[PDB]
Amino acid sequence: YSSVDTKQKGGALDIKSFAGVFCILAAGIVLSCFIAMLETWWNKRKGSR
């Protein structure tokens, strides 16, 4: 009956609350790998810097 959940009068952040931040870094990692694929092909056609 008591709705008084005692423990959460403030608290530290939790990895699972911060997950949405790491998603941006992960998307950056994925997109930089993908972009790197395009130069990794095209430099084979340039044969030069």
Partner 1 sequence: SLQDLSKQTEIPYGTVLDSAVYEHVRMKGLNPFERDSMYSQMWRMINRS
- Residue 32 makes contact with partner 1 by CB under 8 A: no
What is the distance in angstroms between the CA of the first residue and the CA of the last residue of the chain?
Answer: 72
2 binds partner 1 (CB under 8 A): yes
Least Å distance, CB 6 to partner 1, is 4
User: Under the criterion CB under 8 A, does residue 3 sit at the interface with partner 1?
Assistant: no
Query: How many distinct helices (H) and strands (E) make up the chain?
Result: 1, 0
Per CB under 8 A, does 9 bind partner 1?
yes
Binding site for partner 1 (CB under 8 A): 2, 4, 6-7, 9
